Design an enzyme around this catalytic site. Structure first.
Site, PDB file in Angstrom:
ATOM      1  N   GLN B 145       0.807  -1.253   0.000  1.00  0.00           N
ATOM      2  CA  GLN B 145       0.000   0.000   0.000  1.00  0.00           C
ATOM      3  C   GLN B 145       0.830   1.289   0.000  1.00  0.00           C
ATOM      4  N   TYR B 331      16.669 -20.433  44.338  1.00  0.00           N
ATOM      5  CA  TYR B 331      16.072 -21.764  44.051  1.00  0.00           C
ATOM      6  C   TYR B 331      16.663 -22.295  42.740  1.00  0.00           C
ATOM      7  N   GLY B 443       5.404 -27.050  50.509  1.00  0.00           N
ATOM      8  CA  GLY B 443       4.779 -27.770  49.411  1.00  0.00           C
ATOM      9  C   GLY B 443       5.628 -28.284  48.255  1.00  0.00           C
ATOM     10  N   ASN B 479       5.358 -25.503  41.569  1.00  0.00           N
ATOM     11  CA  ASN B 479       6.436 -25.517  42.550  1.00  0.00           C
ATOM     12  C   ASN B 479       7.823 -25.441  41.931  1.00  0.00           C
TER      13      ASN B 479
HETATM   14  C1  F43 Z   1      -3.383  -6.232   1.224  1.00  0.00           C
HETATM   15  C2  F43 Z   1      -4.659  -5.768   1.917  1.00  0.00           C
HETATM   16  C3  F43 Z   1      -5.548  -6.965   2.206  1.00  0.00           C
HETATM   17  C4  F43 Z   1      -5.461  -7.088   3.707  1.00  0.00           C
HETATM   18  O1  F43 Z   1      -5.866  -8.074   4.311  1.00  0.00           O
HETATM   19  N1  F43 Z   1      -4.893  -6.007   4.244  1.00  0.00           N
HETATM   20  C5  F43 Z   1      -4.375  -5.079   3.247  1.00  0.00           C
HETATM   21  C6  F43 Z   1      -2.913  -4.748   3.468  1.00  0.00           C
HETATM   22  C7  F43 Z   1      -2.730  -4.580   4.967  1.00  0.00           C
HETATM   23  C8  F43 Z   1      -1.291  -4.284   5.408  1.00  0.00           C
HETATM   24  C9  F43 Z   1      -0.550  -3.424   4.381  1.00  0.00           C
HETATM   25  C10 F43 Z   1       0.953  -3.312   4.648  1.00  0.00           C
HETATM   26  C11 F43 Z   1       1.755  -3.247   3.364  1.00  0.00           C
HETATM   27  O2  F43 Z   1       1.449  -2.399   2.495  1.00  0.00           O
HETATM   28  O3  F43 Z   1       2.711  -4.044   3.228  1.00  0.00           O
HETATM   29  C12 F43 Z   1      -1.497  -3.616   6.758  1.00  0.00           C
HETATM   30  C13 F43 Z   1      -0.493  -2.520   7.102  1.00  0.00           C
HETATM   31  C14 F43 Z   1      -1.549  -4.652   7.876  1.00  0.00           C
HETATM   32  C15 F43 Z   1      -0.174  -5.259   8.093  1.00  0.00           C
HETATM   33  N2  F43 Z   1       0.041  -6.380   7.554  1.00  0.00           N
HETATM   34  O4  F43 Z   1       0.677  -4.682   8.756  1.00  0.00           O
HETATM   35  C16 F43 Z   1      -2.844  -2.985   6.531  1.00  0.00           C
HETATM   36  N3  F43 Z   1      -3.389  -3.363   5.458  1.00  0.00           N
HETATM   37 NI1  F43 Z   1      -4.921  -2.332   4.565  1.00  0.00          NI
HETATM   38  N4  F43 Z   1      -4.508  -0.708   5.716  1.00  0.00           N
HETATM   39  C17 F43 Z   1      -5.146   0.462   5.676  1.00  0.00           C
HETATM   40  C18 F43 Z   1      -6.239   0.760   4.969  1.00  0.00           C
HETATM   41  C19 F43 Z   1      -6.670   0.045   3.917  1.00  0.00           C
HETATM   42  C20 F43 Z   1      -7.636   0.591   2.898  1.00  0.00           C
HETATM   43  C21 F43 Z   1      -6.973   1.617   1.983  1.00  0.00           C
HETATM   44  C22 F43 Z   1      -7.997   2.352   1.120  1.00  0.00           C
HETATM   45  C23 F43 Z   1      -7.322   3.351   0.201  1.00  0.00           C
HETATM   46  O5  F43 Z   1      -8.009   3.924  -0.671  1.00  0.00           O
HETATM   47  O6  F43 Z   1      -6.101   3.578   0.334  1.00  0.00           O
HETATM   48  C24 F43 Z   1      -8.060  -0.648   2.129  1.00  0.00           C
HETATM   49  C25 F43 Z   1      -9.433  -1.169   2.532  1.00  0.00           C
HETATM   50  C26 F43 Z   1     -10.527  -0.318   1.939  1.00  0.00           C
HETATM   51  O7  F43 Z   1     -10.519  -0.125   0.706  1.00  0.00           O
HETATM   52  O8  F43 Z   1     -11.397   0.153   2.704  1.00  0.00           O
HETATM   53  C27 F43 Z   1      -7.062  -1.653   2.589  1.00  0.00           C
HETATM   54  C28 F43 Z   1      -6.966  -2.851   2.013  1.00  0.00           C
HETATM   55  C29 F43 Z   1      -5.825  -3.760   2.161  1.00  0.00           C
HETATM   56  N5  F43 Z   1      -5.124  -3.835   3.201  1.00  0.00           N
HETATM   57  C30 F43 Z   1      -5.384  -4.723   1.096  1.00  0.00           C
HETATM   58  C31 F43 Z   1      -4.438  -4.054   0.104  1.00  0.00           C
HETATM   59  C32 F43 Z   1      -5.139  -2.960  -0.692  1.00  0.00           C
HETATM   60  C33 F43 Z   1      -4.263  -2.502  -1.838  1.00  0.00           C
HETATM   61  O9  F43 Z   1      -4.006  -3.305  -2.763  1.00  0.00           O
HETATM   62  O10 F43 Z   1      -3.828  -1.332  -1.817  1.00  0.00           O
HETATM   63  N6  F43 Z   1      -6.335  -1.219   3.622  1.00  0.00           N
HETATM   64  C34 F43 Z   1      -6.987   1.962   5.375  1.00  0.00           C
HETATM   65  O11 F43 Z   1      -8.144   2.141   5.034  1.00  0.00           O
HETATM   66  C35 F43 Z   1      -6.339   3.013   6.231  1.00  0.00           C
HETATM   67  C36 F43 Z   1      -5.450   2.352   7.274  1.00  0.00           C
HETATM   68  C37 F43 Z   1      -4.454   1.455   6.559  1.00  0.00           C
HETATM   69  C38 F43 Z   1      -3.652   0.556   7.487  1.00  0.00           C
HETATM   70  C39 F43 Z   1      -2.343   1.174   7.975  1.00  0.00           C
HETATM   71  C40 F43 Z   1      -2.540   2.155   9.109  1.00  0.00           C
HETATM   72  O12 F43 Z   1      -3.549   2.062   9.846  1.00  0.00           O
HETATM   73  O13 F43 Z   1      -1.657   3.022   9.283  1.00  0.00           O
HETATM   74  C41 F43 Z   1      -3.391  -0.698   6.659  1.00  0.00           C
HETATM   75  C42 F43 Z   1      -3.491  -1.987   7.445  1.00  0.00           C
HETATM   76  C1  F43 Z   2       7.687 -16.133  54.595  1.00  0.00           C
HETATM   77  C2  F43 Z   2       7.812 -17.520  53.980  1.00  0.00           C
HETATM   78  C3  F43 Z   2       6.439 -18.151  53.791  1.00  0.00           C
HETATM   79  C4  F43 Z   2       6.250 -18.100  52.295  1.00  0.00           C
HETATM   80  O1  F43 Z   2       5.172 -18.301  51.756  1.00  0.00           O
HETATM   81  N1  F43 Z   2       7.390 -17.795  51.681  1.00  0.00           N
HETATM   82  C5  F43 Z   2       8.458 -17.445  52.609  1.00  0.00           C
HETATM   83  C6  F43 Z   2       9.055 -16.087  52.301  1.00  0.00           C
HETATM   84  C7  F43 Z   2       9.156 -16.009  50.789  1.00  0.00           C
HETATM   85  C8  F43 Z   2       9.685 -14.671  50.268  1.00  0.00           C
HETATM   86  C9  F43 Z   2      10.713 -14.056  51.229  1.00  0.00           C
HETATM   87  C10 F43 Z   2      11.072 -12.605  50.906  1.00  0.00           C
HETATM   88  C11 F43 Z   2      11.331 -11.800  52.164  1.00  0.00           C
HETATM   89  O2  F43 Z   2      12.154 -12.221  53.005  1.00  0.00           O
HETATM   90  O3  F43 Z   2      10.707 -10.727  52.317  1.00  0.00           O
HETATM   91  C12 F43 Z   2      10.231 -15.053  48.900  1.00  0.00           C
HETATM   92  C13 F43 Z   2      11.480 -14.288  48.474  1.00  0.00           C
HETATM   93  C14 F43 Z   2       9.151 -14.974  47.829  1.00  0.00           C
HETATM   94  C15 F43 Z   2       8.766 -13.536  47.565  1.00  0.00           C
HETATM   95  N2  F43 Z   2       7.717 -13.120  48.132  1.00  0.00           N
HETATM   96  O4  F43 Z   2       9.444 -12.829  46.836  1.00  0.00           O
HETATM   97  C16 F43 Z   2      10.597 -16.489  49.155  1.00  0.00           C
HETATM   98  N3  F43 Z   2      10.184 -16.916  50.268  1.00  0.00           N
HETATM   99 NI1  F43 Z   2      10.936 -18.596  51.178  1.00  0.00          NI
HETATM  100  N4  F43 Z   2      12.543 -18.543  49.941  1.00  0.00           N
HETATM  101  C17 F43 Z   2      13.569 -19.390  49.956  1.00  0.00           C
HETATM  102  C18 F43 Z   2      13.690 -20.492  50.700  1.00  0.00           C
HETATM  103  C19 F43 Z   2      12.967 -20.732  51.804  1.00  0.00           C
HETATM  104  C20 F43 Z   2      13.390 -21.723  52.851  1.00  0.00           C
HETATM  105  C21 F43 Z   2      14.572 -21.158  53.635  1.00  0.00           C
HETATM  106  C22 F43 Z   2      15.192 -22.205  54.556  1.00  0.00           C
HETATM  107  C23 F43 Z   2      16.361 -21.626  55.327  1.00  0.00           C
HETATM  108  O5  F43 Z   2      16.893 -22.337  56.207  1.00  0.00           O
HETATM  109  O6  F43 Z   2      16.761 -20.468  55.066  1.00  0.00           O
HETATM  110  C24 F43 Z   2      12.150 -21.876  53.715  1.00  0.00           C
HETATM  111  C25 F43 Z   2      11.387 -23.170  53.456  1.00  0.00           C
HETATM  112  C26 F43 Z   2      12.085 -24.347  54.100  1.00  0.00           C
HETATM  113  O7  F43 Z   2      12.361 -24.290  55.316  1.00  0.00           O
HETATM  114  O8  F43 Z   2      12.355 -25.341  53.393  1.00  0.00           O
HETATM  115  C27 F43 Z   2      11.315 -20.730  53.241  1.00  0.00           C
HETATM  116  C28 F43 Z   2      10.194 -20.376  53.875  1.00  0.00           C
HETATM  117  C29 F43 Z   2       9.522 -19.084  53.705  1.00  0.00           C
HETATM  118  N5  F43 Z   2       9.522 -18.432  52.629  1.00  0.00           N
HETATM  119  C30 F43 Z   2       8.741 -18.400  54.791  1.00  0.00           C
HETATM  120  C31 F43 Z   2       9.628 -17.533  55.685  1.00  0.00           C
HETATM  121  C32 F43 Z   2      10.629 -18.346  56.500  1.00  0.00           C
HETATM  122  C33 F43 Z   2      11.278 -17.470  57.555  1.00  0.00           C
HETATM  123  O9  F43 Z   2      10.593 -17.104  58.538  1.00  0.00           O
HETATM  124  O10 F43 Z   2      12.479 -17.144  57.416  1.00  0.00           O
HETATM  125  N6  F43 Z   2      11.808 -20.154  52.143  1.00  0.00           N
HETATM  126  C34 F43 Z   2      14.712 -21.465  50.277  1.00  0.00           C
HETATM  127  O11 F43 Z   2      14.701 -22.613  50.684  1.00  0.00           O
HETATM  128  C35 F43 Z   2      15.817 -21.058  49.339  1.00  0.00           C
HETATM  129  C36 F43 Z   2      15.287 -20.101  48.283  1.00  0.00           C
HETATM  130  C37 F43 Z   2      14.630 -18.931  48.997  1.00  0.00           C
HETATM  131  C38 F43 Z   2      13.848 -18.005  48.079  1.00  0.00           C
HETATM  132  C39 F43 Z   2      14.666 -16.853  47.509  1.00  0.00           C
HETATM  133  C40 F43 Z   2      15.529 -17.263  46.339  1.00  0.00           C
HETATM  134  O12 F43 Z   2      15.209 -18.253  45.643  1.00  0.00           O
HETATM  135  O13 F43 Z   2      16.540 -16.566  46.099  1.00  0.00           O
HETATM  136  C41 F43 Z   2      12.715 -17.480  48.952  1.00  0.00           C
HETATM  137  C42 F43 Z   2      11.395 -17.348  48.223  1.00  0.00           C
END
Ligand code: F43
Ligand code: F43
Ligand SMILES: C[C@@H](OP(=O)(O)O)[C@H](NC(=O)CCCCCCS)C(=O)O
Ligand SMILES: C[C@@H](OP(=O)(O)O)[C@H](NC(=O)CCCCCCS)C(=O)O
Ligand SMILES: O=S(=O)(O)CCS
Ligand SMILES: [Cl-]
Ligand SMILES: [Cl-]
Ligand SMILES: [K+]
Ligand SMILES: [K+]
Ligand SMILES: [K+]
Ligand SMILES: [K+]
Ligand SMILES: [Mg+2]
Ligand SMILES: [Mg+2]
Ligand SMILES: [Mg+2]
Ligand SMILES: [Mg+2]
Ligand SMILES: [Mg+2]
Ligand SMILES: [Mg+2]
Ligand SMILES: [Mg+2]
Ligand SMILES: [Mg+2]
Ligand SMILES: [Mg+2]
Ligand SMILES: [Mg+2]
Ligand SMILES: [Mg+2]
Ligand SMILES: [Xe]
Ligand SMILES: [Xe]
Ligand SMILES: [Xe]
Ligand SMILES: [Xe]
Ligand SMILES: [Xe]
Ligand SMILES: [Xe]
Ligand SMILES: [Xe]
Ligand SMILES: [Xe]
Ligand SMILES: [Xe]
Lengths: 248, 547, 441, 442
Positions: B145, B331, B443, B479
């Site tokens: 176009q 982790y 979990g 998990n």
């Molecule tokens: C190839 C298609 C079939 C189709 O599924 N989409 C096309 C082409 C598609 C392509 C054209 C990109 C390119 O040129 O490579 C894109 C930009 C979508 C895309 N793929 O990114 C587009 N049209 Ni079309 N297309 C448009 C339009 C239009 C208008 C143009 C009428 C005129 O007299 O010029 C007519 C539909 C109609 O007659 O109502 C139209 C049809 C057509 N449109 C006919 C090509 C017509 C031709 O041979 O020139 N588009 C518009 O009506 C205005 C917005 C304009 C879109 C780009 C933008 O929004 O900036 C573009 C929206």
């Molecule tokens: C608050 C929770 C409950 C929950 O749903 N998620 C928590 C906390 C959540 C927060 C902690 C962020 C913060 O400190 O503000 C985040 C980072 C998730 C988040 N919200 O972005 C996280 N744990 Ni947790 N959490 C972790 C872990 C763990 C290990 C930590 C064990 C230890 O001895 O330190 C234990 C689970 C377990 O005992 O097996 C654990 C539990 C817990 N985890 C207990 C908090 C325990 C505490 O009071 O210190 N996480 C891990 O086991 C290692 C990865 C680590 C994660 C961060 C990372 O991947 O870098 C983080 C993953």
């Protein structure tokens, strides 16, 4: 119940942590106020905030299950659901994340347990959480150096220890006192400063850590040496695979 | 020594084996050149816009430990982790843009319309003329176009059209400027395989402008390509500018012989074509061009695919498209920094090579149990023997993905089959979870607990060869720490076999192209270059903006 | 509900039944229409040869895709009978339900009709491809004892890249319906049926292609809610006169103009028939120009629609080239409005559909040949049943002037769906059903 | 019958209803009650006449916080609901004697609308119930007040929202339990894209009835998805029977034995015990103080395990009266039982996998939410094939008010209208009676 296979100390410790008939060793005594302070959900002596009315003030629908399942006290009261979260060092902390969750749901009612690499969490009704927390803090679930109470910024389970053998804490909630050899909790689990720190006792000896730990390591007991434990995991993998195909 | 020892020593003061360090005395964010830059930037940004922004005093204080540098694997480039965030790394952004803006379009149906429906002749001479017309038209310039306004040629200089064909005679007949020469870009055996796959077919590789792709979306690519193909067909072959046959060309270009990089996604993650979630793991392996340059090292080929996939799938897709914020730079970094995965995978290759020889192992569960268990234990033992390594990959999820990727890739090295490699991946997670009583985040192993059962399933939304799986496979849709590693496992068996491609030979050839902006033959080298701010992307608007 | 009656004729212009209640043709009442619709929901073509060649070459998961080293050499077509029988045992609910599995082409294809029972307890229609796919996947695996390690390739060969792709990309099964996610809107499923699929199944018989297309389009109007309440009679009259050759109106118009006639002469005769039948009357007179008015727009629209169909048959028939139907759909309606002063078919919707249909079948921007369009296509969805049946008649009259003909896009449909009688000759079955229920309405 | 299994059917109370019923009497493909529930779900629509009237009075149409000033229409729709509802029914129905139902609720404020089955016999899917209902009420309102040609389009916006500019009925004042077909995660998922809260709303928070409806809907979807075909059909029927229908009273008895003091672990120990007693599992071999169990019927072990999983959810979340822990129970019941027995967990780990991400996406920043907003079509919870979501329904049923996004927040319209349908409110009673009545026709 068998709970877990294996012939190592780790496997047995994992079984013990789950077995409700196993008495967890009490290694320290913590006051109720200190537990409330460590938890940080309310002030000691502050009223239990309610998420919904008491169950007896509500008229629950006639439901055979509701009638057969006794609610925990905190649920009867309408307590909020709060949490306590622990990080366990991979350097031979007694409890580990998977061990905790499995043990919690064997030992405690109404428990929402979550397991992660650097944190393990339980959510439940507030008043019930406090008694669970006391056991989790007073028993062999916890070591003041290789375990930490962390509501956020839990980084440290996989980090090297500091010169004192303490696990890394971005917020330093638990302070080792080099003058006394004991650990004090300066801040609460979320990191807010405490008025009065909480004595958490002496860290366990390296020899006792290996006695009680539930993690496999080459420098402790290697998982690959617990052949019967590996064999059951492989069995589960194979049976899962065959079940998902199911067209042999 | 271990391939990761160098990175560990340049990361911390202590020797890699040491079990204790000191914290809290590093100065926080002041220890880091990058965090210091960020603090000053946030000050200038907040002041300039009148709204607070980056502030190190918000939240918790970063840098109580060493803020580590990272070695980019296969390089000697060391950067802070922030330099590998995709937002800060123009190379990573350009890698995705080069994929997003690429579509493959056949000319075979078109030439049949020309000769059968229009009754005109197609020859190498007309094809060259068409190709000269379409390279004017494709960046956004007019051929039919009057009074058409066009794109600035300098803003769209990265857009063009090339062709390839398996017929060496037809390839020689076309002006070489428009030809991806299969014989020149691939080794002999691979070139012969690829040419036999393509035969007498003639295929266009269309790349639309980066500036358009960034303004719009991936679904724009195949449409933009089709418009200018259609306009150039009208021009070069002298049909009426819009007659009945013109529609045949549009249908063929937009549907009948088009090959998208990614298929569209369902509504919950609604996205058009050519978004990361639609790229199957086999395509990603074939987009990565390591196979045609590193074919004598199946580990290198496989792990370059892992790096490709880990960045795209975890940092950009899952870490931004599907979430956002700080994201998951680390982790993903775990799979392509510090030579850690390389050490684990070269060990597995060596173990498989000593015991079976590559591709000579039985393709069954016996091989999976053997290789995946041995490599898993090797990987986890390194984290135990080296405290520095464990502190380096501090996230359980990070270690899971790296260890299982080595186990999966190794198993596929042995069997030559990606599906048993995938079974090994899941076996590694089960062992890993039991060895350390931890695995990944909250979990992380949703798909890993579904894993074993769904590896060999055949049911509707369960059964699929790994190469056909992708980020939209149901179990995989959410998990971190899997998808990029899956692309590696998909590549794993083909790299051992010497295959020229994993899943689609047309995709493989379409990126063996020296006119791409991102160099897909050296993905990790490119990431390092972006980290150093040495990568020049396409699509910048500097030409049309003030100084 | 309505008092209208119509005379029903056959595809050779013979009267079959006189004075049939209009609603006897309604998709809601006519048992044959129910049969065609449910048949369309539950029928699947399975390409056993294609599945076998895909496995042989490991070419699975979409165009130009292949996994070297996954090749499987299974003689599926050689064992089609056993495989098909084993599959039917899984597809069926009971031995005595309406399950059908029939081999075609010496075992290369299989026609599958999933039992109606599965759809009474299903939300939509995907049970047909999904139940068929897994049944044939499992039957193949069992036939050759395919291993756990290789079976996933059988799944890819049958259903393609699903579920990584949303579609059954690269699948070797076909349906006339597309997946529900691709509907342009809720209720469009019976519209997303390629015209080429309709022309393939009716094996180019123009009136049967016109009938099948109108049945599907107007049935969709009921599921879409368009043919509800105030508009119901309009769509039934449209179904009857444009798609069912009611009163032999389409046939008679084509008879009167087939030898030398044009769109304009068809228009003049239609307006004449409308005058004679009392459908329209001269409402007022301008200078040497009469303005027509009518008290039943629905019936005028129906008459105009029959003339529209006949003009396509006369115009595209004379050319034996389908492409001009977009021109006929436009200027038949353009001309008749300035001939009469009354609105064109579908109150201008047909003319509008025809403008863009013309554009998108003669431009660079999309669409294609007339055969690839359908009621669910964004280009041709706008008229509510009154345009696409004409496109179906046009492609039927085509003499091979199109590159994308039913053989190019619907070869599997041509071979399999044409074998079901209700789909091949729908007009006959629908008329018999209407007469059979004529006194139950 | 294809299969040889028979089951004993129990009511919600825990009473025997019918002994030795063929398994397939519970199959969605055969059970007349399931067919009725599924077809009801397809054809039922809730119309919010008050909402339609308020939208028109304010011109608040087309989505959240949307309003067109100057388009306001003051129509007394609720005042004339009877005439409007009757006029609409005449358009919705096919004949006077068919199964069309239009019932006013809340003094004319809401309207339960059940589109006739005839319309769906000739329809491809289910969009007919919302579309036919919408246009019928739009036309009835327009005719009731002779709304002008110039204003009628506002009535259309008030009823169906921004459709078709939006793909969904965004801002519509009608509701269904099914979502639009374009939102399916995959073909045949429609019966899975039903929010858990919708199920809990319809069952009026009845634990066992919520479990049944959810299991009915999930497992029926497994048939439409083709998952319950051939080798896998028996697995899914046994799962439906034992996990969702309280077959043999196993779920009920397990909850009874552990409700007072029980935990997930104690429920596991008793289930493993019951399996041994019923011959479902046997000791396959022994390791050092460890017994590896095997089974000759994986499908039956899986069903026993599915029953215990449900019972553990009821015991654990029941004791808390807080649904959130169901993601924990779905995970560690299966984790624990695998290392307790050496046998694969429910759905061969698919339930465990769903629980992993379900936990994550109900306790993290990244998505999901509370247990009630999940469903079988949710990317988080689609992975297990029917064995997980019914437990989420049971848990939300036991919730005493700890959820911000409860059924009252996201399904209030469903809670008022769909719960009026007896089959939707108590599906277990209808499915069991139907099973008994066809017990000798199977
Ligand atoms: C190839 C298609 C079939 C189709 O599924 N989409 C096309 C082409 C598609 C392509 C054209 C990109 C390119 O040129 O490579 C894109 C930009 C979508 C895309 N793929 O990114 C587009 N049209 Ni079309 N297309 C448009 C339009 C239009 C208008 C143009 C009428 C005129 O007299 O010029 C007519 C539909 C109609 O007659 O109502 C139209 C049809 C057509 N449109 C006919 C090509 C017509 C031709 O041979 O020139 N588009 C518009 O009506 C205005 C917005 C304009 C879109 C780009 C933008 O929004 O900036 C573009 C929206
Ligand atoms: C608050 C929770 C409950 C929950 O749903 N998620 C928590 C906390 C959540 C927060 C902690 C962020 C913060 O400190 O503000 C985040 C980072 C998730 C988040 N919200 O972005 C996280 N744990 Ni947790 N959490 C972790 C872990 C763990 C290990 C930590 C064990 C230890 O001895 O330190 C234990 C689970 C377990 O005992 O097996 C654990 C539990 C817990 N985890 C207990 C908090 C325990 C505490 O009071 O210190 N996480 C891990 O086991 C290692 C990865 C680590 C994660 C961060 C990372 O991947 O870098 C983080 C993953
Ligand atoms: C019709 C349809 O094309 P297809 O028939 O799907 O090839 C559609 N294109 C368009 O609507 C083109 C719109 C912009 C170009 C014409 C502007 S007048 C699309 O790409 O989805
Ligand atoms: C679950 C779903 O979220 P919703 O529940 O739909 O909000 C989905 N998000 C994700 O999958 C988050 C994935 C990336 C963040 C977590 C990586 S471990 C999504 O947004 O479509
Ligand atoms: O703690 S959580 O596992 O939810 C967060 C992982 S990034
Ligand atoms: Cl009328
Ligand atoms: Cl009951
Ligand atoms: K900070
Ligand atoms: K020009
Ligand atoms: K963009
Ligand atoms: K099982
Ligand atoms: Mg076998
Ligand atoms: Mg030192
Ligand atoms: Mg050394
Ligand atoms: Mg969305
Ligand atoms: Mg040796
Ligand atoms: Mg005939
Ligand atoms: Mg007669
Ligand atoms: Mg004449
Ligand atoms: Mg039998
Ligand atoms: Mg009851
Ligand atoms: Mg007991
Ligand atoms: Xe390679
Ligand atoms: Xe399938
Ligand atoms: Xe058809
Ligand atoms: Xe009308
Ligand atoms: Xe042609
Ligand atoms: Xe229905
Ligand atoms: Xe409507
Ligand atoms: Xe099974
Ligand atoms: Xe709440």
């Amino acid at each position: 119940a068998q709970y877990y296979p294996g012939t190592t100390k780790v496997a047995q410790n994992r079984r013990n942590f789950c077995n409700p008939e196993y008495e967890l060793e009490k290694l320290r005594e913590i006051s109720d106020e200190d537990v409330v302070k460590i938890l940080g959900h309310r002030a000691p002596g502050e009223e239990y905030p309610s998420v919904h009315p008491p169950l007896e003030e509500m008229d629950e629908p006639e439901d055979a299950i509701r009638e057969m399942v006794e609610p925990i006290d905190g649920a009867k009261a309408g307590d909020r659901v709060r949490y306590i979260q622990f990080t366990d060092s991979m350097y031979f902390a007694p409890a580990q994340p998977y061990v905790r969750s499995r043990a919690y749901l064997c030992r405690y009612r109404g428990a929402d347990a979550g397991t992660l690499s650097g944190r393990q969490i339980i959510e439940t009704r507030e008043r019930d959480l406090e008694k669970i927390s006391k056991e989790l803090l007073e028993t062999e679930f916890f070591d003041p150096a290789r375990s930490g109470v962390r509501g956020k910024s839990v980084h440290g389970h996989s980090l090297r220890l500091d010169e004192d053998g303490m696990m890394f804490d971005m917020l330093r909630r638990q302070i080792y006192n080099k003058d006394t050899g004991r650990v004090e909790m300066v801040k609460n689990q979320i990191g807010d400063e405490l008025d009065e720190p909480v004595d958490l006792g002496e860290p366990l000896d390296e020899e006792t850590l290996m006695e009680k730990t539930t993690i496999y390591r080459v420098d402790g007991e290697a998982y690959r040496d617990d052949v019967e434990a590996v064999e059951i995991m492989q069995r589960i993998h194979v049976l899962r695979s065959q079940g998902g195909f199911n067209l042999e | 020594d271990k391939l990761f020892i160098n990175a560990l020593k340049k990361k911390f003061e202590e020797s890699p084996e040491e079990k204790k360090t000191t914290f809290y005395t590093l100065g926080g964010w002041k220890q880091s050149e990058r965090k210091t830059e960020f603090v000053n930037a946030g000050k200038e940004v907040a002041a300039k816009r009148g709204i607070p922004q980056y502030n190190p005093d918000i939240g918790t204080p970063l840098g109580q430990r060493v803020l580590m540098p990272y070695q980019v694997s296969t390089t000697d480039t060391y950067v802070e982790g922030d330099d590998l965030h995709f937002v800060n790394n123009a190379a990573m952004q350009q890698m995705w843009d080069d994929i997003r803006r690429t579509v493959i379009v056949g000319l075979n149906h078109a030439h049949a319309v020309i000769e059968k429906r229009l009754g005109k002749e197609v020859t190498p001479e007309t094809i060259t003329h068409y190709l000269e017309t379409v390279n004017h038209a494709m960046p956004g310039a007019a051929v039919v176009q009057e009074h058409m306004v066009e794109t600035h040629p300098a803003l769209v200089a990265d857009s063009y059209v090339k062709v390839f064909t398996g017929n060496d005679e037809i390839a020689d007949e076309i002006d070489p400027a428009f030809v991806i020469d299969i014989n020149k870009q691939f080794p002999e055996d691979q070139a012969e395989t690829l040419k036999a796959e393509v035969g007498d077919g003639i295929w266009q590789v269309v790349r639309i402008p980066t500036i358009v792709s960034r303004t719009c979306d991936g679904a724009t690519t195949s449409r933009w390509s089709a418009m200018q193909i259609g306009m150039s067909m009208i021009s070069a072959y002298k049909q009426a500018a819009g007659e009945a046959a013109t529609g045949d060309f549009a249908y063929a270009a937009k549907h009948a012989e088009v090959i998208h990089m990614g298929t569209y996604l369902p509504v919950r993650r609604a996205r058009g074509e050519n978004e990361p979630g639609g790229v199957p793991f086999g395509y990603l392996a074939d987009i990565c061009q390591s196979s045609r340059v590193n074919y004598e090292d199946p580990v290198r080929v496989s792990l370059d695919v892992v790096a490709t996939g880990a960045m795209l799938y975890d940092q950009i897709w899952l870490g931004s498209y599907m979430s956002g914020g700080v994201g998951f730079t680390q982790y993903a970094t775990a799979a392509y920094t510090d030579n850690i995965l390389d050490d684990f995978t070269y060990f597995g290759k060596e173990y498989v090579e000593d015991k079976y020889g590559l591709c000579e192992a039985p393709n069954n569960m016996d091989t999976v149990l053997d290789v995946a268990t041995e490599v898993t234990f090797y990987g986890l033992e390194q984290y135990e023997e080296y405290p520095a390594l464990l502190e380096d990959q501090f996230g359980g999820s990070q270690r899971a993905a790296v260890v299982a990727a080595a186990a999966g890739c190794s198993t596929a090295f042995a069997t030559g089959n990606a599906q048993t490699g995938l079974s090994g991946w899941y076996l590694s997670m089960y062992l890993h979870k039991e060895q350390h009583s931890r695995l990944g985040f909250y979990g992380y192993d949703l798909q890993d607990q579904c894993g074993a059962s769904n590896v060999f399933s055949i049911r509707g939304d369960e059964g699929l060869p790994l190469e056909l799986r992708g980020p939209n496979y149901p179990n995989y849709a959410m998990n971190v720490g899997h998808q990029g590693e899956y692309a590696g496992i998909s590549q794993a068996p083909h790299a051992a076999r010497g295959d020229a491609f994993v899943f689609n030979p047309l995709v493989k050839i379409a990126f063996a192209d020296d006119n791409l902006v991102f160099d897909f033959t050296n993905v990790r080298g490119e990431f390092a270059k972006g980290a150093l701010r040495e990568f020049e992307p396409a699509g910048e608007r500097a030409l049309i903006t003030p100084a | 509900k309505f008092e209208d009656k119509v005379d029903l004729y056959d595809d050779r212009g013979n009267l079959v039944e006189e004075q049939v209640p209009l609603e006897a043709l309604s998709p809601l009442r006519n048992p044959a229409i129910k049969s065609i619709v449910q048949g369309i929901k539950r029928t699947v073509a399975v390409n056993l040869e294609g599945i076998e060649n895909a496995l042989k070459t490991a070419k699975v998961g979409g165009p130009a895709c292949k996994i070297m080293g996954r090749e499987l050499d299974l003689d599926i077509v050689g064992n089609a009978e056993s495989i098909a029988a084993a599959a039917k045992e899984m597809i069926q609910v009971t031995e005595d339900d309406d399950t059908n599995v029939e081999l075609l082409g010496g075992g290369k294809r299989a026609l599958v009709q999933v039992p109606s029972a599965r759809f009474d307890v299903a939300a939509e229609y995907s049970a047909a491809p999904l139940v068929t796919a897994t049944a044939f996947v499992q039957a193949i695996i069992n036939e050759f004892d395919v291993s756990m390690y290789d079976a996933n390739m059988v799944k890819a060969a049958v259903l393609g890249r699903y579920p990584q792709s949303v579609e059954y990309m690269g699948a070797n099964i076909a349906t006339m319906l597309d997946i529900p996610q691709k509907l342009e809107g809720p209720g469009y499923a019976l519209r997303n049926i390629m015209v080429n699929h309709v022309v393939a199944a009716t094996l180019k018989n123009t009136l049967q292609a016109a009938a099948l297309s109108t049945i599907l389009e107007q049935t969709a109007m009921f599921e879409m809610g368009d043919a509800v309440g105030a508009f119901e009679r309009m769509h039934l009259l449209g179904l009857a006169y444009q798609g069912m050759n009611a009163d032999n109106l389409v046939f008679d118009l084509v008879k009167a103009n087939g030898k030398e006639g044009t769109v304009g002469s068809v228009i003049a005769d239609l307006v004449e028939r409308a005058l004679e039948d009392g459908v329209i009357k001269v409402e007022k007179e301008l200078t040497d120009y009469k303005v027509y008015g009518t008290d039943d727009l629905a019936m005028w629209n129906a008459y105009a629609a029959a003339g529209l169909m006949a003009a396509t048959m006369v115009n595209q028939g004379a050319a034996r080239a389908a492409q001009g139907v977009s021109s006929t759909l436009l200027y038949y309606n353009d001309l008749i409005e300035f001939e009469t002063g009354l609105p064109s078919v579908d109150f201008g919707k047909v003319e509008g559909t025809a403008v863009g249909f013309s554009f998108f079948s003669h431009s660079i921007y999309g669409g294609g040949g007339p055969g690839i369009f359908n009621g669910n296509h964004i280009v041709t969805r706008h008229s509510k049943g009154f345009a696409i049946p004409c496109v179906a008649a046009a492609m039927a009259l085509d003499a091979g002037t199109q590159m994308f003909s039913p053989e190019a896009t619907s070869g599997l449909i041509k071979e399999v769906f044409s074998q079901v009688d209700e789909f091949r000759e729908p007009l006959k079955y629908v008329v018999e059903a209407a007469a059979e229920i004529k006194n139950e309405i």
